Design a protein around this ligand. Sequence first.
Ligand SMILES: [Zn+2]
Ligand SMILES: [Zn+2]
Lengths: 205, 220, 247
Amino acid sequence: ARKSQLQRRFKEFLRQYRFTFKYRDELKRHYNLGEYWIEVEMEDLASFDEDLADYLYKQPAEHLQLLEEAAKEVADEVTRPRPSGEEVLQDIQVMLKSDASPSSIRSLKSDMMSHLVKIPGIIIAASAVRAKATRISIQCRSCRNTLTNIAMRPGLEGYALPRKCNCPLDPYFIMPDKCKCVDFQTLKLQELPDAVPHGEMPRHM
Amino acid sequence: RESLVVNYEDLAAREHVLAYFLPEAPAELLQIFDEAALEVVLAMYPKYDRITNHIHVRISHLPLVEELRSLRQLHLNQLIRTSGVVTSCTGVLPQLSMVKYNCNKCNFVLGPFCQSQNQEVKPGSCPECQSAGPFEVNMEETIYQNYQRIRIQESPGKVAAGRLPRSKDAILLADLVDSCKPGDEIELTGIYHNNYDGSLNTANGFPVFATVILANHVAK
Amino acid sequence: VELREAQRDYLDFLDDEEDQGIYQSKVRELISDNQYRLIVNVNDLRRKNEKRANRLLNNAFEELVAFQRALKDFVASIDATYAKQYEEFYVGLEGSFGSKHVSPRTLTSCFLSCVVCVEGIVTKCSLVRPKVVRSVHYCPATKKTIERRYSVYPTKDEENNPLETEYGLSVYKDHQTITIQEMPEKAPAGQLPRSVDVILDDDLVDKAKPGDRVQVVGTYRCLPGKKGGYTSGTFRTVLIACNVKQM
Ligand SMILES: [Zn+2]
Ligand SMILES: [Zn+2]
């Protein structure tokens, strides 16, 4: 309920921030060129409305989804006369940027759980890019019934298939030809040599 | 801060019964002392309910106890004082506390469960839907604690000729984390513990228990 | 309706003898040479039908199945005698794909269910293995024969009589797996290489060897998570080749 109002506030912020419409034109250009991603500076959000900026610092998971939905709606409203064939409205990724000073990696403790953090470091390993599903469909063994458009959570979180069929127990299987996938990668970060304490081993993330 | 230091000598001088019961019943008496200290501090200052909800009580001095070699069956579930040298450190790790679970069928958030260090938390069932299936941890509302593990070896200077130094494991929690560098000489007061799941060798071999020390004070 | 229209368009594509076409002579040569694979230039199809080419590139499996059905019908119409030997024919692709010409380093999930062309070097190869298509079983107790098709291995009769397998009457097809690595001459200096896995079947099994530079055109697909109550949400991607070329 109130989350819809917050999404509307984000929509108004995106459509109204400026004496030229920075985010509006940036989103239009990115959508036209085919780059479905934007970068948002949180100082601009704080200037427009401090409430949402403060909210983003404590509960990023939900407010990020709300902001993504608002950005998608803004992009849809900006690009009304889209060319024929391109009827499908594609999702948009939102990135964050700020000028705040970073914090040392050694300061990570329990109190920083589920919060937004900024950390400097050096990369030492990068795994290959792989595919992760976002929407999946399943089919039953006996009656061949189908459940479609199951939403998957972001991050390193799995999914549990249902055990009851609305037939033997656990009859569901995943169909590979009807899924949407995105790219993901894993990296290794090491503490900066200039900040490691003397006579102590570095730490990783 | 979140810790308080209490001297055993003064406690023995004032109230003998608490000092007498202290070595043979550390956990419950420490819990009672923590509750009393929290009550007194909250009486002194009321704002701390917003800052810190708990306070730890730590014993500073003790009658010096035998070295790592003499730790045996007589010291089970008692309070001991040892001196040694740090050889390894596992860093800072997050451990669960007052865990809240999210149901899989419905969206009910289960009540907090105390995270004991002996066994893993096993929630019974969801009160509303009465289901007993798998559950997931509510990361947004769960409380977390600091955890660290250290390996301690006897000082080479005090080791008698013809025998090798012996080592033991210790666990630090909350404010004790990151208080010892590797290769440093420390003194600990701790609890000699066995009552944790997986301590008994059962798959094969003799019925041998593994001992782990839970420390609550560090002296450089 | 869509599949039938695609099949009709594919059938119309091949009948070019009265339009200076060459594909009829190609099919005649294939029949003469006892081959069951045809190579069709993507550029010519795009020139003749851009919508069909776009649909095939953006959707491979259904369009390829329709094209194989059309080729089966065409070969039947030419000489149904030859079509009896083989159950189905296979399609090869050639030409300039443009944006879909993708190196192993630049492969992404955006090319899922599409037709891609890659150029690389072979580093790993596997032994040739047979794969079952049909199975025939006989019961000495009752003198009865049963047939099974694959796309569970029976062992006993209805009255628990033992069953004996007829290996000769069964049908097997070749299968092999190879690995393609990005050429070091093009990879950025100081960075680890990236590799792709390719599956070869039927007559393409013995056309590649390790340490050789090849170009492979094929479809890009994911592998579903294997059986389990919990899934990690990550699928492995494996290329299914339709044409391999020695550059
Ligand atoms: Zn079913
Ligand atoms: Zn429930």
